[PDB]
Design an enzyme around this catalytic site. Structure first.
Site, PDB file in Angstrom:
ATOM      1  N   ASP A  48       0.841  -1.202   0.000  1.00 29.16           N
ATOM      2  CA  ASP A  48       0.000   0.000   0.000  1.00 29.16           C
ATOM      3  C   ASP A  48       0.876   1.252   0.000  1.00 29.16           C
ATOM      4  OD1 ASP A  48      -1.438  -2.238   1.697  1.00 29.16           O
ATOM      5  OD2 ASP A  48      -3.055  -0.981   0.974  1.00 29.16           O
ATOM      6  N   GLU A  71      -5.103   7.680   0.595  1.00 25.51           N
ATOM      7  CA  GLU A  71      -5.563   6.992   1.840  1.00 25.51           C
ATOM      8  C   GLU A  71      -4.532   6.939   2.939  1.00 25.51           C
ATOM      9  OE1 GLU A  71      -6.639   3.063   1.289  1.00 25.51           O
ATOM     10  OE2 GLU A  71      -6.948   2.748   3.385  1.00 25.51           O
ATOM     11  N   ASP A 141      -6.225   5.686  -4.037  1.00 28.47           N
ATOM     12  CA  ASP A 141      -6.258   4.481  -3.167  1.00 28.47           C
ATOM     13  C   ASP A 141      -5.141   3.612  -3.741  1.00 28.47           C
ATOM     14  OD1 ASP A 141      -6.729   2.393  -1.750  1.00 28.47           O
ATOM     15  OD2 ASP A 141      -8.947   2.286  -2.041  1.00 28.47           O
ATOM     16  N   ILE A 143      -3.707   0.735  -2.841  1.00 27.27           N
ATOM     17  CA  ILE A 143      -4.171  -0.632  -3.013  1.00 27.27           C
ATOM     18  C   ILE A 143      -5.652  -0.615  -2.595  1.00 27.27           C
ATOM     19  CG2 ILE A 143      -4.261  -3.015  -2.284  1.00 27.27           C
ATOM     20  CD1 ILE A 143      -1.284  -3.016  -2.072  1.00 27.27           C
ATOM     21  N   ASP A 144      -6.602  -0.648  -3.451  1.00 27.59           N
ATOM     22  CA  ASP A 144      -8.041  -0.646  -3.084  1.00 27.59           C
ATOM     23  C   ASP A 144      -8.387  -2.107  -2.993  1.00 27.59           C
ATOM     24  OD1 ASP A 144     -10.907  -0.664  -4.691  1.00 27.59           O
ATOM     25  OD2 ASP A 144     -10.635   1.356  -3.845  1.00 27.59           O
ATOM     26  N   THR A 146      -7.310  -4.021   0.097  1.00 27.24           N
ATOM     27  CA  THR A 146      -6.100  -4.649   0.720  1.00 27.24           C
ATOM     28  C   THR A 146      -6.424  -6.040   1.261  1.00 27.24           C
ATOM     29  OG1 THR A 146      -5.247  -2.463   1.149  1.00 27.24           O
ATOM     30  CG2 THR A 146      -4.303  -4.277   2.443  1.00 27.24           C
ATOM     31  N   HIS A 240     -18.285  -5.134   4.466  1.00 26.69           N
ATOM     32  CA  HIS A 240     -18.286  -3.947   3.635  1.00 26.69           C
ATOM     33  C   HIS A 240     -19.623  -3.562   3.010  1.00 26.69           C
ATOM     34  CE1 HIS A 240     -13.658  -4.353   2.788  1.00 26.69           C
ATOM     35  NE2 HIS A 240     -13.917  -4.094   4.066  1.00 26.69           N
ATOM     36  N   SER A 263     -12.454  -4.820  -4.565  1.00 28.57           N
ATOM     37  CA  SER A 263     -12.022  -3.594  -5.207  1.00 28.57           C
ATOM     38  C   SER A 263     -12.878  -3.002  -6.319  1.00 28.57           C
ATOM     39  CB  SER A 263     -10.597  -3.799  -5.797  1.00 28.57           C
ATOM     40  OG  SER A 263     -10.582  -4.363  -7.103  1.00 28.57           O
ATOM     41  N   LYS A 266     -14.515  -4.198  -9.808  1.00 28.83           N
ATOM     42  CA  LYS A 266     -15.949  -4.375 -10.049  1.00 28.83           C
ATOM     43  C   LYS A 266     -16.501  -3.339 -11.044  1.00 28.83           C
ATOM     44  CE  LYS A 266     -17.079  -4.630  -5.561  1.00 28.83           C
ATOM     45  NZ  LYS A 266     -15.668  -4.895  -5.078  1.00 28.83           N
ATOM     46  N   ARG A 280     -23.851  -2.098  -3.420  1.00 29.85           N
ATOM     47  CA  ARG A 280     -23.080  -1.843  -2.199  1.00 29.85           C
ATOM     48  C   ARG A 280     -23.972  -1.116  -1.217  1.00 29.85           C
ATOM     49  NH1 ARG A 280     -17.361  -1.504  -1.942  1.00 29.85           N
ATOM     50  NH2 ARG A 280     -16.605  -0.786   0.072  1.00 29.85           N
ATOM     51  N   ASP A 293     -12.648   5.170  -2.797  1.00 28.46           N
ATOM     52  CA  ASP A 293     -13.149   3.860  -3.125  1.00 28.46           C
ATOM     53  C   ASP A 293     -14.097   3.887  -4.336  1.00 28.46           C
ATOM     54  OD1 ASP A 293     -11.859   2.475  -1.175  1.00 28.46           O
ATOM     55  OD2 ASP A 293     -13.424   2.692   0.347  1.00 28.46           O
TER      56      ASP A 293
HETATM   57  N1  LIG Z   1     -17.571  -0.738   7.032  1.00 24.81           N
HETATM   58  C1  LIG Z   1     -17.300  -0.527   5.750  1.00 24.81           C
HETATM   59  N2  LIG Z   1     -18.261  -0.246   4.860  1.00 24.81           N
HETATM   60  C2  LIG Z   1     -18.035   0.006   3.514  1.00 24.81           C
HETATM   61  N3  LIG Z   1     -16.818   0.012   2.993  1.00 24.81           N
HETATM   62  C3  LIG Z   1     -15.837  -0.236   3.855  1.00 24.81           C
HETATM   63  C4  LIG Z   1     -15.955  -0.552   5.222  1.00 24.81           C
HETATM   64  N4  LIG Z   1     -14.741  -0.794   5.793  1.00 24.81           N
HETATM   65  C5  LIG Z   1     -13.853  -0.644   4.808  1.00 24.81           C
HETATM   66  N5  LIG Z   1     -14.479  -0.325   3.604  1.00 24.81           N
HETATM   67  C6  LIG Z   1     -13.850  -0.063   2.261  1.00 24.81           C
HETATM   68  O1  LIG Z   1     -14.085  -1.192   1.457  1.00 24.81           O
HETATM   69  C7  LIG Z   1     -13.130  -0.813   0.380  1.00 24.81           C
HETATM   70  C8  LIG Z   1     -12.964  -2.058  -0.499  1.00 24.81           C
HETATM   71  O2  LIG Z   1     -14.297  -2.450  -1.033  1.00 24.81           O
HETATM   72  P1  LIG Z   1     -14.549  -3.885  -1.602  1.00 24.81           P
HETATM   73  O3  LIG Z   1     -13.332  -4.588  -2.059  1.00 24.81           O
HETATM   74  O4  LIG Z   1     -15.486  -3.686  -2.661  1.00 24.81           O
HETATM   75  O5  LIG Z   1     -15.269  -4.683  -0.527  1.00 24.81           O
HETATM   76  C9  LIG Z   1     -11.858  -0.379   1.097  1.00 24.81           C
HETATM   77  O6  LIG Z   1     -11.016   0.355   0.221  1.00 24.81           O
HETATM   78  C10 LIG Z   1     -12.371   0.274   2.382  1.00 24.81           C
HETATM   79  O7  LIG Z   1     -12.251   1.720   2.365  1.00 24.81           O
HETATM   80 MG   LIG Z   2      -6.506   1.200   0.060  1.00 30.96          MG
HETATM   81 MG   LIG Z   3      -7.008   0.473   3.809  1.00 28.27          MG
END
Ligand SMILES: Nc1ncnc2c1ncn2[C@@H]1O[C@H](COP(=O)(O)O)[C@@H](O)[C@H]1O
Ligand SMILES: [Mg+2]
Ligand SMILES: [Mg+2]
Length: 354
Positions: A48, A71, A141, A143-144, A146, A240, A263, A266, A280, A293
């Site tokens: 990251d 970030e 971001d 690494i989106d 992680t 998430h 990430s 998608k 989401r 994000d």
């Molecule tokens: N409680 C949460 N609700 C929604 N997004 C979150 C949460 N915690 C972390 N994230 C984000 O989820 C992003 C990744 O989304 P994804 O891979 O689609 O699930 C990260 O970059 C975080 O900023």
């Molecule tokens: Mg990140």
């Molecule tokens: Mg992070």
């Protein structure tokens, strides 16, 4: 329009994409010394920080006064940790300059030479802008996803440029994305470090194998007519988004196919026309989504002909509210408006039914 910025973004993401692809298993095996826990218990790794360092240093070498919302922060990192960040950058430079150097493009310069541990800390900490309504800033971001990265699965390297609160340019590297996994074909050169997707507002959305990043192929969302044939895009991490309420939406629309992956890859599959609806929904309504994000995917999906809103009100996302989005949840689709509004009103009804 924004020619120089697009070239800078593309090469910065490209170089960071090779680094993170290369690191993935070294960070996983050695997940006791390269992985730090942040204040919200989320993980941050050498990958990251290295990706953030490469991309901000390329931004600053080309645009010295530019503002960046990134970030990560270097606060508290030990010298040992920061030496590991520098080493990964230099190891990646040795592999990258053999094969992928871009003529007439600078990643570093006299002012930002990226040589020392103090250089690394300084560059990472140029990502401390808080965003806002007016003016130009970058949104990054490094690494989106992680947790996807640490599972050896999907993750993305995401950069956008926001001007007067609207995303003008996006670039997403998906270093591990194999399109054959979905139902589609992979392009020549995709195997070394995946794909880069990019778009500038008003000029279309395009992709290329990361290793190429010279020949660009235009992309567009697909247009299926029946929701019963559509495919959803959802994350893997159950904290998430609200998977059970997304299942309720799918059942109501008779959707039986879904793709789960981490990430902003998608958004890239939606923009390529390989899936129809990104869901989401928020589990807790106090959460405010981070702009990093969603900003890069917002312009990519718009330019590919799709629609992007919150998950309840059905209003566009506002990238001028600072580091976070004030709305609840995010939903994107291939459109048209009728499809999108059906999905978002179903989402609002399911959430209100709690
Ligand atoms: N409680 C949460 N609700 C929604 N997004 C979150 C949460 N915690 C972390 N994230 C984000 O989820 C992003 C990744 O989304 P994804 O891979 O689609 O699930 C990260 O970059 C975080 O900023
Ligand atoms: Mg990140
Ligand atoms: Mg992070």
């Amino acid at each position: 329009a924004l020619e120089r910025e697009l070239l800078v973004a593309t090469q910065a993401v490209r170089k960071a994409s090779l680094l993170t692809k290369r690191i993935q298993s070294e960070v996983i095996s050695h997940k006791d010394s390269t992985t730090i826990t942040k204040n919200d218990n989320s993980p941050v790794t050498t990958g990251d920080y290295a990706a953030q360092t490469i991309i901000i240093n390329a931004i600053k070498s080309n645009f010295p006064d530019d503002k960046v919302v990134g970030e990560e922060s270097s606060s508290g990192l030990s010298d040992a940790f920061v030496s590991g960040i520098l080493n990964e950058i230099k190891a990646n430079d040795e592999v990258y300059n053999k094969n992928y150097k871009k003529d007439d493009f600078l990643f570093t310069n006299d002012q930002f030479p990226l040589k020392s541990l103090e250089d690394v800390r300084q560059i990472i900490d140029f990502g401390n802008y808080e965003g806002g309504r007016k003016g130009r800033f970058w949104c990054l971001d490094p690494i989106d996803g992680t947790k996807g990265f640490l599972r050896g699965e999907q993750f993305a390297v995401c950069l956008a440029l926001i001007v007067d609160g609207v995303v003008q340019l996006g670039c997403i590297g998906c270093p591990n994305l194999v399109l054959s996994s979905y139902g589609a074909q992979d392009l020549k050169g995709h195997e070394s470090f995946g794909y880069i997707f990019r778009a500038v507002r008003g000029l279309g959305a395009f992709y290329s194998p990361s290793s190429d990043a010279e020949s660009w192929t235009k992309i567009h969302v697909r247009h299926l007519k029946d929701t019963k044939d559509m495919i959803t895009l959802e994350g893997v991490e159950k904290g998430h988004s609200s998977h059970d309420e997304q299942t309720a939406i799918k059942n109501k629309l008779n959707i039986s196919k879904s793709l789960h992956l981490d990430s902003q890859a998608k958004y890239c599959l939606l923009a390529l026309g390989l899936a129809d609806v990104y869901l989401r929904l928020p589990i807790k309504l106090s959460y405010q989504e981070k702009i990093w994000d969603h900003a890069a995917g917002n312009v990519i999906v718009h330019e590919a002909g799709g629609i992007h809103t919150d998950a309840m009100e059905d209003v566009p996302l506002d990238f001028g509210n600072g580091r976070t989005l004030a709305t609840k949840g995010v939903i994107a689709s291939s459109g048209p408006r009728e499809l999108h509004d059906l999905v978002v009103s179903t989402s609002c009804d399911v959430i209100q039914s709690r």
